[PDB]
Design a protein around this ligand. Sequence first.
Ligand code: SAM
Ligand code: SAM
Ligand code: ZN
Ligand code: ZN
Lengths: 268, 258
Amino acid sequence: SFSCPLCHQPLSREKNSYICPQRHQFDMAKEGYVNLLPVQHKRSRDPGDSAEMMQARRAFLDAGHYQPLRDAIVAQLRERLDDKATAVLDIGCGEGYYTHAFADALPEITTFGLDVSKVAIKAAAKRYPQVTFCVASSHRLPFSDTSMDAIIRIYAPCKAEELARVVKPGGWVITATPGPRHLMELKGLIYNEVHLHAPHAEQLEGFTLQQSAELCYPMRLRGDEAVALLQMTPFAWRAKPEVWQTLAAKEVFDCQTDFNIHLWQRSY
Amino acid sequence: SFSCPLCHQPLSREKNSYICPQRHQFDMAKEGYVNLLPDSAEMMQARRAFLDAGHYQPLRDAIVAQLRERLDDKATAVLDIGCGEGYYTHAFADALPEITTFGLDVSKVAIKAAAKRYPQVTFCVASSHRLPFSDTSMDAIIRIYAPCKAEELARVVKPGGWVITATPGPRHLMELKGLIYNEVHLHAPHAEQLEGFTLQQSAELCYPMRLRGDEAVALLQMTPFAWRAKPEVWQTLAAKEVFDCQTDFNIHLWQRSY
Ligand SMILES: C[S@+](CC[C@H](N)C(=O)[O-])C[C@H]1O[C@@H](n2cnc3c(N)ncnc32)[C@H](O)[C@@H]1O
Ligand SMILES: C[S@+](CC[C@H](N)C(=O)[O-])C[C@H]1O[C@@H](n2cnc3c(N)ncnc32)[C@H](O)[C@@H]1O
Ligand SMILES: [Zn+2]
Ligand SMILES: [Zn+2]
């Protein structure tokens, strides 16, 4: 039920191509995703998130350190969605560590994983068949209005209007971002005085906060795992050698995680 | 000296904004920079950390020379392309106290930082695609590692004006890329040419550096080949208390035909 990245009209499908009323065709890569981006802009980049690191976030998550969060969302959905659900969408579905679990937990429905990392989507789509992965910029969702029963937003940004447009009325939106104390001990190894900042409750014109939770728990990280984790965080470069030397030789590093989950309904 | 990102016409500077005979709105932010626009912050920051540690001071030093040496009493304007957060621009601005030093970049976060830190430089945010200035207004345009069609170069530059570019030479950061390369081959970068301009001087500037693990990491974060670096390579380099690598800077002094 995609929309045309270009004319924004329903994408009708023929075998393995998507075509819109005005003859815009998008083919499916051999793996199964649907590229939906332009032809040659900014694709050329300044990564940070290229194959190397994707394999990291991935390899890190495959240790399930974050599974609690997935479990939380999965159950969250297993509950709100009724038996009249057709499909859910996962904005920012990276290589789909989280999404494939949602799908495996919602068989009767179609699971979509949108992300903007071609390299990521490729990896996802190849590993997880139970998900229809599409590759595009979510500044304007690649879906027809009122087409989704729920949308999962795990730390990936999005506009309110698009939420209102794509989500059926009575539908859901589930968002999860880091909480104040998320990964303190780590930030504790590199900052002058660690400033945790108290997040203001946000709002989605069009929805209703039906539940707000917090999920905090401690992780016993091994040397590598820690460094690995430090490696994929905004501050990584403030870590002076000493930090990495110790953090890496550390038998067990202790770090707590604090995620902030939300759950709104698309008003009827 | 600006030029409408809209009607491509002159710009009236009235108090804290600019407009033309077109009701086209472009105002001045609280920091002093102007946005004529129709990476992250941790890096603009990590970059500035590295640049301020003074490892590219030589480069800034030499370019300043070029300027002090070529512009005369009649100079007035001097645009810097890709000015980022002002690390080099301002240095010029000082050196040239009689002319106006403009600094441009497409990075608000970065521009803003400089706008706020370097007051002796009129900064603005826009693309390098079409220079935000009127024809033949600049007396010199500095272009350290920035892209810019030679046409805009020629159009905005007063005749007999100058263009100073700075780009990586054959050996630039060898050792770095030597860390993330099976084969150590990266042959002769050739012919940067500027139609409409006549090369007046070419210089190379190579000197060794003694970087600290994090400095190396930040530098690699500024490098085009970074995306190739494996994790083990990032962790390792970061752990090294002292990493050694050379610099290879090519500098061209182009003069605008009369
Ligand atoms: C709210 S937490 C933040 C994690 C990290 N500790 C940090 O400081 O940014 C969820 C993170 O998991 C990652 N994520 C979400 N979906 C993913 C996917 N499908 N594959 C790989 N990573 C994913 C994102 O980088 C996101 O920031
Ligand atoms: C002189 S450095 C050479 C380092 C280069 N990244 C390398 O591969 O070794 C050139 C880089 O610095 C940027 N630059 C010049 N001035 C800057 C400023 N004031 N703030 C941020 N970046 C700046 C250029 O646009 C370019 O990306
Ligand atoms: Zn179309
Ligand atoms: Zn105009």
